[PDB]
Design a protein around this nucleic acid. Structure first.
Lengths: 757, 476, 138, 600
RNA sequence: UGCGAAAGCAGUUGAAGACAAGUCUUGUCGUUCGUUAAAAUGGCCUCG
């Protein structure tokens, strides 16, 4: 009856290799410059630059070949190497695949395989019919080897011939032309520049000569290179430091030139084709074009994220392709690819996947290097220890929630992700972001935070919900004070009510309630009202103290008011609170700590058994239908018939969920249809012979009262979220940002010739 | 790239009536008894004072016509519906009809009675007939053509009749209120001279007006009551007034957020606005030097600046007014494509906002404490700097000379509740950073001494407020 | 934009005596008259005025003080004396009232804000008292 | 929802036809037009006696009666008020059948007799509808003929449904249009269901369907808001118009125990998805949407009660939750007497709130899954424990802990499987019976820590554990749902310092300020006085409890002399608290000429 | 770092290897094992 299928996309793919800098972007612009080809972790999207739409999508699942192969794309080359809309995809292991865009995908692509002995393919590049491949083999520093790649038509095989080798490569970059390679080694360090297809350029020199004497006197941030760029001509080489200082070196005589604007680590450098301009970017979220003739600079500030990579793309520098990072979300690395028009610096094309914020860091994500070790960044020392600590936490520790809050708009079926201090509105039918709106105050896009400012925490959108009608948006925010002050521990809790006409795309704040439920009292649960009461124009907010407040929208006052209140000032605290409302609206089920209460809405007090004591704290209380009520505790899940007041079925959850999730996240793992049934979702780590970073999740469809399991299905990766679309199907989110769905004649020759001409 | 966010720094019915800012005060030779507005443009209003009637230009707010023929005191200046004529009553009992804006010629002079004629009002539906109420206690209904005998002579009032009203959409009905406390309704279609019925007010009725076709609101004694003709009983009654309410006016379908307004004079110096859509509840009020005898507001179709007029027994007249390259102009109406890419410049920033935008933390703090600086706006810049994490940074390069402006405000801002928490943060930091300089600076010491006395005073207030809070909980 | 801010404690939609002037001002909503009454600072006059004031008018007097305190917090102190005596003298009358929170919501909210300053005012006072002691002995 | 006591309308006459209590209801007809929510009149046709109209309030009274000869049976009766050619009139239409030889259709007009008319009908009259707007009387005959008459009984139209032996016909109005549906038995338990619309022909047939498996002889039928309800063999079948499709079957267990032949059953509707079901002398108010028994009432003073008609509420539109129903009650005795009685019925709000816990339909931890991943017999135990000899502490503990593999004397998360409440309740009964006096087993300590400790045993625990301080201390800390009315009693009675503070902590944690304050008022003035004297002799949880008391005591009850001691004592406390707060914050917190000595 | 409420309640930091400075003593880590465990004078466009 039910079936699972992946629908939406995932994160854009990146060359996630530490050594290579400035070559992280793999997306390629067509030779006609009419469309941008971007690889995702699960597909390849072709966007038309002129119209700003995804004209084509090549999904790995559809092809048997790509499904078997997809590993990550290391590069895309326009045309086919073996031989007008072909692309050659090189994967890290060595699979070379010739695909076609602008047409119908062929089920038998010209698959090949380069033969490499314990080498991981890192990069490939060409100038005119000549191809070289760079490969990585194994002091914790990887070594590199450069081969020449040729295709012999007779054998139809790719032959690789060794050309060169370097050891202990720390940082590496390739010119825009692809004909020069600059790299830094520990042979403290030495920088060497090599021509790739010729022997014309071959130079090497220690970093100490380039470094200034004062730099030798100062801290290690001043001696730590974070970026490197090489000009096409090879006459100039830019080195960026963790201090924020850029040094251009004249290779002929090793003369130095200092450019100093960045206050924090410079993350990306790129030269112009003529070499007369230098693009620089870092933590300021500002892109700087340094005019090298007069040493001047032009700015593009208030970008969406910190600039990981910069490039000038075109025969005439028509475009700037930037990679942005959005370091606010520590739970994941959120890359956004931005193609700007050089003439007016307007976004020609911005591409990103969904941006969930999970509870904890996932897999092997590491924060970008900064001058200092902050919450959003790592220091130069902190990187290795943080990586070890991340692995050790994912192995040893027992709390493995990685669960994310997601909302669905009943009217539009748009998917709302509460990013930190903002909301991303994402259309999973089109698999494209529709909006990004800031819903809180704070230092959001006023400036780029650097150094100590990077320890500031912007207000966090902890809950976001829609009314059943869908015309109203309810948001709950926690604003944090700055540190090192008397009021450095008084969190502020804010509630906001927004309205939006269906035609427009921007929500408008209609009411703001500061410190609802008192001072320093969190709003642990929010529940919009049913259609019966106020025509869905109301909601309940519930505390960790057992307080309940009912807000409703009053037409005369024209805005929301606290219609009802019940403030039992309990002297105990518990974040395990759950709320359910009967579809008739007469009764409200309020579960606090380990006790469930049935409160009459009209009196807004206990019904006149409404007390139900449970084994453990209630994480979720939901009613599949008017009759049955499903209550999940920390040890079990129970189906209680309200009409009989008896448990029909009880399932043991302790083996799978004992201390994995914080209280309240079972709510976002357990979802419920209003017609057919509900779903339970259970994740388990996979281990063979100590726990491993891999996870496997399983979905269970349950009928009303949990008598039977309609469907039992398995997904091969951690499912952060699962919720019920307002259709029959359920949408679930997986930590690779993947949204799956579980659901039920001479004239003819003349015409042809005229068309050809 | 996104545009830089801008720094983020009563009732609608009240806000509208706040707009009658311009107040002009005039002196009359005697008490102004009646005020009436011309129904037509320019909607000039006529004030009856002493032995003359003066008409005031709406735009100029100055007298344009004076009718000084009256030998004794005049008691009315009501216009006809079309605004050409105005009728006035005299203590001698003579009612005189003049053409508006033509004081010389007298169209019609009628001797209603030998007793004073206090009320002379034109019938709203019918232009021909004029109503007169005298101390004779008979409200004769005259016709301009028949100047020698009234068309009808309503009677039945056992005391002075000083109020007469015509119910809209009911030309046959006539309402009269006497000092008996009775409001009498008459039918001119029938024989008349006997009321259809009487409504009891229990206090002398000083003015009666028909708010709507079915609702009539009468002000007598210390309250005004709204009566429904269909049910013949008072729906509602308001007694917020302290003295005896004297006059009341009603304006409907004017451009305010509130559809209709009921103005009522009080004789305590108060004239207040009542909203008929919300059960005749108070929404506005004005206070004057002395008792108010007459009130008027410009009609609905004012077509210009609106006027609110108050009449006082001392003769004062108070007016509040709500004031209402040959191809450069082509605009491309004949062209295929029209491209508009111009962007308006952002609204002017202040000095402190410019400093924050340019990362001038120390200078932004200086702009906070400048002479003539709004206290709320001073609190924003202090909150912005805290939010940016720049509180110590703003306070490094400072000495006693440039620290006193901050401490002076903190000395006053600690008293305010909103700024109390912010003052604690800033004062805590400056002490932690400038402990040593304070020892060597005598002036900085006394600033802290008076700061310690005030913060001690605030502690007593907050402790006190807790005790009343405990008291209040006990009562409930 | 034009959104109105609010707070969670807004439970709104859930010889020498001056009593006669006070009573008339309260009945007639005469702010100017009421202000002249409240200008007096002599505690003897306050208690006496509330003592002879009619119990019915006592409730609205609490409302007016709540509003005047809220607009101007610097007058929190002197008007708290007025509120304090209204409760003490008319405590018996106030008990026999169907509802108090909804009609005294402004008062109750106004009193909450002042108490919230108390924990932090002590913290500032302790740091002041420490530094005041340090140079005074030096 | 509730059922009122029946109040008598009239006493049925002692006629031979009415003597058969099983068929008594069929001989009494209730007019549809006069019996509704807003009408205060009931027009009733008693076979062989008369057709009578009664006013219900303020007292039952007879207003009009039309005598009928005793040999006649009333087959259909209806009355409606309206305007006829214009005078306000009341039209009465009734059909009488005499020994099956002839059928009489009669129409009577009354001024609010103006006229009386009589014709011979072709077959037995089953249903009569009066249309005052068109001045028409519509009669449905057993032979399938629907005949439309004027108020003078002149035949205007006649429609044949082509089927005979009509058994059920019901009128209903939807969107202003009049409709009627009929049921005609066939052979082999088959039935033709026809839906007819009343507008060349004023009768238009909309649907005709054959229904299989629908028996008449043992079936009770009623229709309400487009749903036809069939009671048969304890199961209520719900058929939905306009096609009469079976939607739901509701099994009613309380009828399945009825022996076939002796139990008299009546079935009528009262509101949306709510009906009245009577079994002999018992009356039930049932909700079919939730399958709940909203109310039940037994009439001990009558043998049987048969529903005749009920004024139905359209609860979706009407704010009124009160209606009435009329039935025939039969008294107990050698000379049974039948009487017409009316019952006032409160149907409720039609919400789930009314139905909760009232199902008329009468466990074990199951593994979540039937079948290399990170890991995060009650009946037997009771028998073993019960088989011990009295006062055997060691074995009772040994059997309980060993069999259940419980490792700790207190409840832990690993004991989830034991949480079956039935086992716990029995063991508590055993522990109480097995042990009395000063020696309880360690099992009681484990149960006292159990989150699912039965509510039934919570009362009086503190008294039972009063003897042993250790058990008393445990119950305060961990025993769930301990009553507050008790906890306050021990709070003001116990003198131990330690127990008072723990009781203070437990009371505030599990009970609201409002809830506790009400019970504090009940306590005696001397006991609270001692508690106040105790204080003057964590602490804020005690003081906050004191502050609650003073509010409970009120301003009148407090006494000045004691008030001075409390006032002096607290002022000392406030001074100390201010002192400590100051300490707490503290922990949180060149010359032109100088002479010096040079060091060589 | 773990649990917890926001309050808090418990606990945690070690062994190397390599290099720079002084002249045998100290620091650092683009390096490993284990443990739940500040500071290169350097600030954010134009489109009136």
């Amino acid at each position: 009856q039910y079936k699972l299928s992946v629908v939406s996309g995932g994160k854009p793919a990146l060359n996630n290799l530490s050594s290579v800098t400035g070559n992280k972007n793999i997306a390629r612009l067509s030779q006609d410059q009419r469309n941008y080809i971007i690889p995702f972790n699960n597909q390849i999207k072709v966007y038309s630059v002129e119209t700003r739409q995804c004209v084509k999508t090549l999904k790995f699942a559809n092809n048997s070949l790509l499904s078997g192969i997809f590993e990550s794309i290391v590069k895309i080359l326009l045309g086919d190497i073996t031989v007008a809309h072909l692309i050659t995809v090189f994967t890290n292991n060595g699979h070379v695949i010739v695909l076609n865009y602008k047409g119908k995908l062929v089920e038998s692509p010209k698959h090949f395989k380069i033969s490499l002995a314990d080498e991981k393919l890192a990069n490939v590049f060409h100038s005119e019919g000549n191809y070289r491949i760079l490969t990585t083999f194994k002091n914790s520093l990887q070594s590199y080897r450069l081969y020449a790649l040729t295709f012999d038509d007779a054998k139809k095989q790719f032959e690789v011939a060794h050309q060169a080798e370097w050891h202990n490569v720390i940082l590496s970059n390739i010119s825009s032309n692809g004909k020069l390679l600059a790299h830094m080694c520990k042979d403290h360090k030495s920088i060497s520049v090599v021509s790739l297809f010729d022997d014309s350029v071959n130079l090497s020199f220690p970093l100490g000569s380039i470094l200034s004497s004062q730099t030798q006197s100062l801290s290690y941030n001043t001696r730590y290179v974070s970026s490197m760029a090489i000009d096409n001509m090879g006459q100039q080489l830019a080195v960026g430091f963790a201090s924020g200082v850029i040094s251009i070196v004249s290779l002929a005589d090793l003369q130095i030139r200092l450019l100093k604007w960045h206050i924090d680590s410079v993350l990306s450098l790129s030269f112009s084709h003529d070499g007369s301009y230098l693009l620089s970017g870092g933590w300021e979220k500002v892109m700087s074009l340094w005019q090298l003739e007069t040493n001047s600079q032009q700015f593009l500030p208030r970008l969406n994220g910190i600039i990981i990579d910069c490039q000038v793309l075109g025969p005439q520098g028509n475009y700037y392709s930037l990679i942005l990072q959005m370091t606010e979300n520590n739970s994941n690395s959120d890359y956004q690819f931005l193609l700007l028009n050089a003439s007016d610096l307007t976004s020609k094309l911005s591409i990103n996947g969904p941006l969930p914020v999970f509870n904890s860091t996932i897999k092997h994500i590491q924060q970008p290097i900064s001058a200092m070790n902050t919450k959003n960044s790592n220091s130069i020392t902190s990187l290795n220890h943080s990586k070890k600590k991340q692995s050790r936490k994912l192995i040893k520790s027992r709390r493995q929630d990685f669960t994310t809050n997601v909302e669905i708009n009943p009217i539009n079926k748009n998917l709302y992700f509460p990013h930190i201090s903002a909301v991303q509105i994402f259309d999973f039918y089109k698999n494209e972001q529709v909006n990004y709106q800031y819903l809180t105050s704070g230092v959001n896009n006023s400036m780029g935070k650097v150094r100590f400012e990077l320890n500031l925490q912007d207000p966090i959108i902890t809950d976001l919900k829609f009314t059943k009608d869908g015309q109203w948006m309810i948001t709950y925010e926690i604003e944090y004070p700055p540190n090192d002050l008397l009021s450095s521990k008084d969190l502020t809790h804010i509630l906001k009510f927004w309205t939006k006409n269906d035609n427009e795309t921007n929500w408008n704040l209609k009411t703001k309630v500061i410190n609802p439920h008192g001072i320093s009292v969190p709003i642990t649960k929010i529940l919009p009202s049913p259609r019966s009461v106020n025509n869905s124009q109301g909601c309940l907010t519930a505390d960790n103290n057992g307080g309940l407040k009912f807000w409703s929208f009053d037409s005369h006052e024209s805005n929301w008011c606290l219609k009802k209140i019940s403030l039992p000032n309990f002297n105990h605290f518990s974040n395990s609170v759950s709320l359910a409302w009967s579809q008739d609206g007469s009764l409200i089920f309020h579960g606090f700590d380990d006790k469930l209460q049935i409160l009459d809405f009209d009196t807004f007090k206990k019904f006149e058994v409404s007390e139900f004591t449970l084994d453990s704290e209630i994480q979720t209380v939901k009613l599949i239908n008017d009759t049955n009520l499903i209550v999940a505790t920390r040890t079990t899940l129970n189906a209680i018939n309200l009409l009989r007041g008896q448990v029909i079925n009880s399932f043991d959850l302790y083996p799978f969920v004992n201390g994995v999730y914080k209280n309240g996240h079972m709510d976002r793992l357990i979802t419920c249809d209003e017609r057919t049934g509900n779903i339970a979702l259970v994740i388990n780590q996979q281990l063979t012979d100590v726990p491993t970073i891999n996870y496997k999740s399983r979905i269970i469809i349950f009928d009303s009262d949990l008598s039977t399991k309609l469907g039992n299905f398995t997904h091969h990766e951690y499912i952060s979220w699962i919720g019920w679309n307002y259709d029959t199907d359920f949408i679930f989110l997986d930590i690779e940002s993947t949204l799956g769905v579980v659901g039920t004649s001479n004239s003819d020759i003349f015409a042809e010739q005229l068309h050809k001409l | 790239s996104t545009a830089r966010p801008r720094i983020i720094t009563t009732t609608p019915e009240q806000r509208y009536w706040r707009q009658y800012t311009s107040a002009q005060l005039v002196k009359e030779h005697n008490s102004v008894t009646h005020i009436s507005f011309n129904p037509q443009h320019p909607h000039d209003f006529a004030v009856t004072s002493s032995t003359r009637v003066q008409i005031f230009s709406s735009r100029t707010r100055q007298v344009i016509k004076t009718f000084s023929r009256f030998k004794d005191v005049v008691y009315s200046a009501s216009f006809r519906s079309d605004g050409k004529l105005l009728c006035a009553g005299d203590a001698t009992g003579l009612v005189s009809v003049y053409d508006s804006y033509n004081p010389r010629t007298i169209l019609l002079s009628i001797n209603a009675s030998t007793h004073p004629t206090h009320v002379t009002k034109f019938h709203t539906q019918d232009n021909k007939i004029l109503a007169t109420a005298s101390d004779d206690r008979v409200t004769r209904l005259w016709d301009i053509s028949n100047a020698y005998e009234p068309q009808l002579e309503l009677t039945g009032a056992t005391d002075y009749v000083r109020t007469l009203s015509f119910i809209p959409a009911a030309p046959h009905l006539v309402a009269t209120g006497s000092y008996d406390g009775l409001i009498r309704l008459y039918d001119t279609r029938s024989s008349g001279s006997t009321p259809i019925y009487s409504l009891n007010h229990d206090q002398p009725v000083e003015n009666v007006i028909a708010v709507s076709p079915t609702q009539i609101v009468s002000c007598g004694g210390n309250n005004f009551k709204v009566w429904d003709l269909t049910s013949n009983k008072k729906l509602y009654e308001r007694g917020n007034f302290n003295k005896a309410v004297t006059c009341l006016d009603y304006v409907e379908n004017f451009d305010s957020p509130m559809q209709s307004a009921l103005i009522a004079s009080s004789l305590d110096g108060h004239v207040k606005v009542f909203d008929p859509l919300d059960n005749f509840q108070v929404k506005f009020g004005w206070k004057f030097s002395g008792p108010v005898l007459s009130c008027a507001v410009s009609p609905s179709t004012a077509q210009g600046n609106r006027h609110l007029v108050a009449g006082l027994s001392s003769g004062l007249l108070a007016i509040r007014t709500k004031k209402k390259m040959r191809g450069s102009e082509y605009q491309g109406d004949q062209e295929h494509i029209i491209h508009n890419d111009k962007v308006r410049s952002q609204r002017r920033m202040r000095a402190f906002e410019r400093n924050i935008n340019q990362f001038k933390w120390s200078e932004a703090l200086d702009n906070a404490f400048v002479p003539g600086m709004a206290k709320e706006l001073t609190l924003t810049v202090l909150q912005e700097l805290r939010k940016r994490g720049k509180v110590r940074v703003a306070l490094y390069g400072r000495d006693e000379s440039t620290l006193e402006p901050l401490l002076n405000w903190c000395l006053k801002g600690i008293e305010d509740v909103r700024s109390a928490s912010i003052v604690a943060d800033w004062v805590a930091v400056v002490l932690e950073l400038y402990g040593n300089t304070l020892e060597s600076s005598p002036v900085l010491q006394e600033l802290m001494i008076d700061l310690k006395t005030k913060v001690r005073h605030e502690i007593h207030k907050s402790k006190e407020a807790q005790r009343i809070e405990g008291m209040l909980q006990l009562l409930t | 934009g034009n959104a109105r801010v609010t707070s969670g404690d807004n439970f709104k939609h859930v010889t020498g005596t001056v009593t006669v002037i006070l009573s008339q001002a309260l009945q007639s909503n005469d702010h100017s008259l009421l202000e002249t009454v409240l200008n007096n600072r002599d505690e003897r006059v306050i208690r006496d005025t509330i003592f002879r004031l009619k119990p019915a008018l006592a409730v609205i007097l609490l409302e007016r003080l709540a509003e005047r305190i809220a607009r101007q917090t610097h007058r929190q102190g002197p008007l708290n004396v007025w509120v304090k005596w209204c409760l003490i003298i008319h405590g018996g009358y106030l008990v026999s009232i169907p509802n108090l929170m909804s009609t005294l919501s402004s008062l109750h909210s106004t009193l909450k804000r002042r108490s919230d300053l108390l924990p932090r005012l002590l913290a500032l006072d302790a740091r002041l008292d420490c530094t005041i002691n340090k140079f005074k002995t030096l | 929802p509730s059922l009122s006591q029946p109040f008598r309308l009239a006493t049925l006459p002692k006629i031979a036809s009415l003597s058969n209590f099983s068929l008594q209801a069929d001989y009494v007809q209730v007019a549809d037009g006069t019996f509704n929510e807003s009408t205060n009149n009931i027009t009733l046709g008693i076979s062989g006696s008369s057709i009578s109209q009664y006013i219900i309030n303020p007292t039952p009274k007879l207003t009009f009666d039309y005598p009928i000869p005793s040999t006649n049976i009333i087959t259909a009766c209806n009355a409606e008020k309206g305007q006829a050619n214009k005078r306000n009139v009341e039209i009465w239409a009734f059909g009488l059948m005499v020994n099956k030889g002839n059928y009489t259709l009669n129409v009577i007009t009354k001024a609010l007799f103006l006229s009386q008319y009589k014709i011979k009908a072709k077959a037995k009259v089953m249903s009569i509808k009066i249309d005052t707007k068109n001045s028409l009387v519509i009669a449905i005959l057993q032979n399938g003929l629907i005949e439309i008459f004027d108020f003078k009984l002149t035949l205007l139209h006649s429609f044949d449904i082509s089927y005979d032996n009509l058994k059920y016909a019901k009128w209903f109005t939807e969107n202003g249009t009049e409709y009627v549906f009929v049921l005609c038995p066939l052979q082999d338990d088959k039935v033709c269901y026809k839906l007819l619309e009343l507008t060349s022909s004023p009768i238009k047939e909309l649907s005709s369907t054959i229904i299989e498996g629908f028996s008449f002889e043992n079936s009770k039928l009623c229709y309400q808001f487009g749903k036809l309800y069939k009671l048969n063999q304890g199961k209520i079948y719900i058929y939905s118009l306009p096609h009469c499709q079976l939607q739901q079957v509701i099994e009613f267990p309380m009828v399945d125990k009825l022996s076939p032949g002796d139990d008299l059953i009546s079935f009528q509707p009262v509101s949306v998805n709510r009906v009245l079901l009577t079994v002999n002398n018992v009356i039930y108010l049932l909700d079919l949407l939730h399958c709940s028994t909203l109310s039940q009432r037994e009439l001990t003073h009558v043998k049987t009660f048969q529903l005749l008609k009920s004024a139905v509420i359209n609860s979706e539109k009407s704010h009124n939750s009160k209606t009435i129903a009329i039935g025939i009650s039969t008294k107990n005795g050698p000379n049974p007497t039948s009487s017409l009685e009316i019952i006032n019925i409160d149907v409720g709000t039609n919400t789930l709130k009314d139905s909760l816990g009232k199902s008329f339909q009468v466990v074990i931890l199951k593994p979540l899954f039937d079948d290399r991943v990170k890991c995060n017999h009650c009946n037997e135990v009771i028998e073993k424990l019960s088989a011990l000899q009295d006062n055997d502490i060691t074995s009772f503990d040994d059997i309980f802990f060993k069999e259940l593999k419980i490792k700790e004397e207190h409840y832990t998360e690993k004991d989830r499987y034991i949480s079956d409440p039935g086992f716990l309740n029995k063991v508590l009964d055993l522990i109480f019976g097995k042990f009395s006096g000063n020696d309880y087993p360690k099992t009681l300590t484990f149960l006292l820590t159990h989150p699912l400790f039965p509510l039934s045993r919570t009362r009086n625990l503190l008294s039972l554990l009063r003897d042993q301080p250790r058990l008393f201390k445990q119950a305060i800390v961990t025993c769930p749902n301990l009553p507050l009315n008790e906890l306050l009693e021990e709070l003001f009675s116990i003198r131990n310092r330690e127990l008072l503070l723990d009781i203070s902590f437990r009371i505030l944690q599990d009970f609201t300020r409002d809830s506790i304050k009400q019970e504090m008022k009940k306590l005696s003035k001397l006991d609270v006085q001692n508690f106040i004297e105790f204080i003057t002799s964590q602490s804020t949880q005690l003081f906050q409890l004191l502050s609650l008391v003073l509010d409970s005591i009120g301003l009148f009850s407090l006494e000045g002399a004691l008030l001075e001691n409390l006032t002096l004592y607290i002022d000392k406390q406030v001074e100390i608290a201010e002192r400590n707060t100051e300490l707490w914050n503290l922990i949180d917190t060149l010359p032109t000429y100088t002479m010096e000595y040079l060091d060589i």
